[PDB]
A paper describes a structure:
Ribosome recycling by the twin‐ATPase ABCE1 is a key regulatory process in mRNA translation and surveillance and in ribosome‐associated protein quality control in Eukarya and Archaea. In concert with the A‐site factor, ABCE1 splits the pre‐SC into the small (SSU) and large (LSU) ribosomal subunit. ABCE1 additionally possesses an essential N‐terminal iron–sulfur cluster domain (FeSD) (Barthelme et al, 2007) and a composite hinge region, which comprises a hinge 1 stretch between the NBDs and a hinge 2 stretch at the C terminus, and connects the two NBDs.
To gain molecular information about the post‐splitting complex, we solved the structure of the archaeal post‐SC by cryogenic electron microscopy (cryo‐EM) to an overall resolution of 2.8 Å. To stabilize the post‐SC, a well‐characterized, hydrolysis‐deficient ABCE1 mutant was used. This mutant, with both catalytic glutamates being substituted by alanine (E238A/E485A, short IIEA), efficiently split 70S ribosomes and remained quantitatively bound to 30S subunits (Nürenberg‐Goloub et al, 2018). The NBSs of ABCE1 adopt the closed, nucleotide‐occluded state with two ATP‐mimicking Mg2+‐AMP‐PNP molecules bound in both NBSs. Yet, in all obtained cryo‐EM structures of pre‐ and post‐SCs, the identity of the bound nucleotides, especially in NBSII, remained unclear. Based on our high‐resolution data, we can resolve both catalytic pockets and unambiguously identify the non‐hydrolysable ATP‐analogue AMP‐PNP complexed with a Mg2+ ion in each NBS. Comparison with the best‐resolved structure of the pre‐SC (Brown et al, 2015) reveals that the functionally important hinge region opens up in the post‐SC, allowing ABCE1 to adopt the nucleotide‐occluded state. In contrast, the entire hinge 1 region opens up relative to hinge 2, which results in a 5 Å shift of the hinge 2 β‐sheets β25 and β26 and a 10 Å movement of hinge 1 helix α15. The FeSD is linked to the main twin‐ATPase body via a flexible linker connecting the cantilever β‐sheet β4 with NBD1. This linker (D73‐V79 in S. solfataricus) forms an α‐helix in free ABCE1 and the pre‐SC (Karcher et al, 2008; Brown et al, 2015), but unfolds into a loop in the post‐SC. The FeSD is embedded in a pocket between rRNA h44, the h5‐h15 junction, and the universally conserved ribosomal protein uS12.
Residue numbers in the entry:
A (entry chain Q): 1 to 56
B (entry chain M): 1 to 102
C (entry chain L): 67 to 132
D (entry chain V): 2 to 150
E (entry chain T): 1 to 64
F (entry chain C): 1 to 193
Write the structure that this text describes.
RNA sequence: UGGAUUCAACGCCGGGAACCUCACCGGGGGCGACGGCAGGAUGAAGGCCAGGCUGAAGGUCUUGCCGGACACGCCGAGAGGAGGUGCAUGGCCGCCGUCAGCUCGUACCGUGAGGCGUCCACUUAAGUGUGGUAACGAGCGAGACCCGCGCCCCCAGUUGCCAGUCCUUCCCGCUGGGGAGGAGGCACUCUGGGGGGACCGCCGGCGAUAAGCCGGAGGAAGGAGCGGGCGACGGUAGGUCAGUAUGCCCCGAAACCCCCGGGCUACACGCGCGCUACAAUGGGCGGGACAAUGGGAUCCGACCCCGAAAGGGGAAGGGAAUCCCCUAAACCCGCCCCCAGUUCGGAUCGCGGGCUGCAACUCGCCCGCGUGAAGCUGGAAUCCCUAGUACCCGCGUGUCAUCAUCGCGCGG
């Protein structure tokens, strides 16, 4: 078994694969408006804990 | 005499007011000339998510908001005043920044 | 220093009406204005209603078609 | 009398006609060709459009002071028919207005602050105010409620 | 549409009127000040609704 | 670094800390934390109901914990200390977790819920509500609300005064959701004394 | 590849997919923690020089290579699974429904299930209230509450504003007037903290004299001022295990992980929502005007230069009331067109020139010349909307390396 390991975690720099939620790890609907990186779901779950309020 | 800008920002008007009152009362404890807590435009970080995971059903949105209140205070720069405004408590949910105009 | 040519024109109308009244102290004139167009001296308070989700770009009540 | 006292379009055409008598206001060799912007569809239909354009720019620099090419680009831009697609605003080309500004700096009407754009000269504002007082007279034959000003 | 004094407004007004009747005038402004120095409210519209209700109660009493 | 960036960063970091500790100190009634960046270092304070459990065996736990803190999360110099909830029976996430812990022990849900309700309303709450939702009483799932006292649901006074807590009870056959809402002895608008 | 199919699927899954995303296809390569089993390091578990295969690969290999070191060659037992199950669950969402309902304590009625209250009449947006009443009281919900807008006062005056004052300077000239920069100061505007103000309060009428409705006055505001947020008990095996969490079943060295390429972008057709139009209530050309919301670090980028354009080079300032994005379009003035498949319409296609990116064929966006498709107002039927609303106009932002006929918002 003389070989070479080939998982190759490729470092994307732009793309839906480049960005990943820091909580769940989802790749698409990620919030990045003011330095966030969060899936819309997670954000809706935790926004109060961050201080976001729902007065409208 | 060269002046000192103090830009301070928070999410709580009351902590903000506490700090400004600290500064007012300390300047008048001494006699250095304050420039009022000029209130700057407050930042409304708005994030309009859809509140549904399913993608099914009527589309409904959560408009979440974070508010950052901002004040600036100009006070003449003295070593005394500077030492004590450094000694200020500056609670946890507040940022400050002492620039100096010279 | 504002929105549109009509809004500017109305704001100017208001401003100069008030100017004339406060320059002259003539209440017969004030009443002439207030019966021609009360909004000449009092302002129009109306503003635009915030747009709401369903086809929000169009309006607060403008809605998508079913 | 002055630019603010008279209207704009009349002044622009009159001062264009007068700018034809200036030698540093030659059109460039690519004028009879090109449009004024991507937002346009067709060549200018006039032959003296160059003079009309530099007249307009001259007046704009009178009014708005230390201004440059990008600001003027967004003023000379406009709406585009994007086909079946909806309409949007697009800026104009810069070469027309640049060559114009350079012609005017040659003729002596504008100068070029190192930063913050270009500024009308005394001889330039004299030129414009002369044409304006002239025009004001010719339409004071009409409105005496404008003779007032 | 519909502007109707709710139950707690009405109850509070009636109790105040019975407990301190000759303190409440026929003046809305005075009645306002009085409810405010009396009951804790912290709410202008509530204060004003209560004041209006005791105002017209006073009136109905003067009428019988 | 802009200022809103700073606020956002602090909130997100703290939220992830809170998540981790919620996972790891659920036996301890972990109510929450607070964080201050003193000059000598960043000192944090864990509010929980069993500091005995969070310290473990002579500071073992806080030690590996602070290691995790400075490593996995950007922290200058962690200075963990510990404190209690002054009235945990008025706190509602600690109670939700205690209830989930009970249901996992195997206690029947009616008994556990009514025990917790009795405890809270004796420890002095104006109101309490408890929803248990899931595979209770067989394979088809249902929801049961146990309530006592006086509790508001809607409005800013609800959003502020009542304390809400949520927990999962991971049992053999699946999850039981535990919602708890506690209204303490404090007053609302239409009182008007 | 899938999910969703009346309301409540079909510009929805923030679903604007070049790779990734991805779950589909063709091919290629890695993965057993813990134990034990075949063994054992003897120089190798593992990496590895030049090449052949290979799409390309120390993947593999004859040929050889050592930096100093254990075990899928075998079992269990697993890690991970965007694999199945949303009729196994949680959480969230939608709908019933921002509807006005849901209940309780005591009393009474009834053998009882249950009833009453919670009914009737007026009234209200409202089980909101008035009155009558075996009901009296209460609670959740509604309302109160929170956010914003609009008028006033106080405070505050920077990065905001510039009227007044002074200074300096440039033009017209009819010697009258206009602008610019400095101190000046917060006047005006504006900003943002705290207060006030509106309560059917006053007059009159209707209803019953009540609840309240209406008209009017005055007022910034007049009838919950306007607009939002907070969505009760509960149901809907509604949707979501393809966001996370989670039971069971399954894969488990493949149904786990990574890479290349393709696909999701195919098209005889049916449907939904929309964009552009079918012209004069206009098209083109040239001139003239007037916004707000928001956003900016490898990011906005003024300003200068180059270029016909798209775009290119350099670059002040700006971590945000300081700088920039940002002089909007509809509108107006003048000139051409004068009711026609047209100077309407811009499908399509050819040539060329560019930007992003590792990659632009499949399959991106932009520019220029050229081409010049249907379409001349639309049956049955159907949708949205009550005031700064609808219609019309453009702008911002989210998505974003580049891509907006979309979403959320902004003003005119
Ligand atoms: Mg009922
Ligand atoms: Mg409410
Ligand atoms: Mg009111
Ligand atoms: Mg279901
Ligand atoms: Mg189903
Ligand atoms: Mg055409
Ligand atoms: Mg025709
Ligand atoms: Mg979309
Ligand atoms: Zn997430």
């Amino acid at each position: 078994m003389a070989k070479a390991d080939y998982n190759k975690r490729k470092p994307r720099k732009f793309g839906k694969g480049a960005r990943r939620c820091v909580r769940c790890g989802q790749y698409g609907p990620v919030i990045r408006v003011h330095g966030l990186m969060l899936c819309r779901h997670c954000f809706r779950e935790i926004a109060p804990k961050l201080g976001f309020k729902k007065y409208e | 005499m060269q002046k000192a800008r103090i830009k301070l920002a928070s999410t709580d008007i009351k902590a903000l007011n506490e700090v400004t009152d600290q500064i007012r009362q300390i300047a008048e404890r001494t006699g250095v000339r304050m420039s009022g807590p000029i209130p700057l435009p407050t930042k409304r970080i708005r994030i309009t998510t859809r509140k549904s995971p399913d993608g099914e059903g009527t589309a409904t949105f959560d408009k979440f908001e974070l508010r950052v209140h901002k004040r600036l205070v100009d006070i003449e720069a003295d070593e005394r005043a500077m030492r004590q405004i450094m000694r200020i408590r500056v609670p946890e949910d507040v940022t400050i920044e002492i620039e100096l105009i010279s | 220093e504002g929105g549109g040519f009509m809004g500017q024109a109305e704001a100017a109308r208001v401003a100069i009406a008030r100017a004339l009244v406060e320059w002259t102290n003539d209440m017969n004139l004030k009443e002439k204005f207030m019966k021609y167009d009360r909004t000449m001296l009092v302002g129009d308070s109306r503003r635009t209603e915030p747009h709401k989700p369903n086809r929000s770009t169009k309006g607060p009540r403008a809605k998508r078609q079913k | 009398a002055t630019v603010y006292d008279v209207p704009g379009d009349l002044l622009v055409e009159r001062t264009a006609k007068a700018l034809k008598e200036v030698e540093a206001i030659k059109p460039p060799e690519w004028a009879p060709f090109v449009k004024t912007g991507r937002h346009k569809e067709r060549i200018p239909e006039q032959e003296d459009w160059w003079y009309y354009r530099v007249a307009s720019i001259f007046r704009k620099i009178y009014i708005d002071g230390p201004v440059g090419i990008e600001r003027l680009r967004t003023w000379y831009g406009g709406r585009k028919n994007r086909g079946h697609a909806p309409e949007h605003f697009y800026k104009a080309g810069g070469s027309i207005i640049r060559k114009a500004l350079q012609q005017l700096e040659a003729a002596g009407f504008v100068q070029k602050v190192p930063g913050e754009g270009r500024i009308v000269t005394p001889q330039g504002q004299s030129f414009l105010d002369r044409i304006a007082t002239e025009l004001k007279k010719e339409l004071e034959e009409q409105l005496p409620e404008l003779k007032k000003y | 549409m519909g502007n109707i004094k709710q139950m707690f407004i009405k109850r509070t007004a009636r109790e105040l009127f019975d407990r301190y009747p000759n303190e409440f005038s026929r003046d809305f402004e005075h009645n306002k000040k009085k409810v405010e120095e009396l009951t804790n409210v912290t709410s202008k519209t509530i204060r004003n609704r209560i004041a209006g209700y005791i105002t017209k109660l006073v009136r109905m009493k003067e009428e019988g | 670094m802009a200022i809103e960036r700073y606020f956002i960063e602090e909130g997100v970091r703290e939220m992830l800390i809170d998540e981790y500790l919620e996972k790891e100190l659920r036996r301890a009634g972990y109510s929450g934390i607070d964080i201050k960046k003193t000059p000598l270092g960043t000192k944090v304070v864990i509010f929980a109901a069993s500091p005995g459990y969070v310290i473990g065996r002579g500071g073992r736990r806080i030690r590996e914990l602070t290691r995790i803190l400075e490593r996995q999360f950007g922290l200058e110099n962690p200075q963990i200390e510990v404190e209690e909830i002054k009235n945990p029976y008025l706190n509602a996430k600690v109670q939700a977790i205690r209830l989930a812990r009970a249901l996992e022990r195997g206690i029947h849900f009616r008994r556990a819920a009514y025990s917790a309700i009795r405890a809270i309303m004796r420890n002095g709450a104006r109101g309490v509500e408890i929803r248990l939702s899931g595979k209770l009483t067989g394979e088809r799932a249902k929801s049961v609300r146990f309530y006592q006292g006086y509790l508001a649901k809607v409005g800013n006074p609800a959003e502020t005064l009542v304390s809400r807590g949520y927990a999962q009870a991971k049992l053999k056959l699946g999850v039981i959701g535990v919602k708890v809402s506690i209204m303490p002895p404090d007053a609302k608008l239409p009182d008007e004394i």
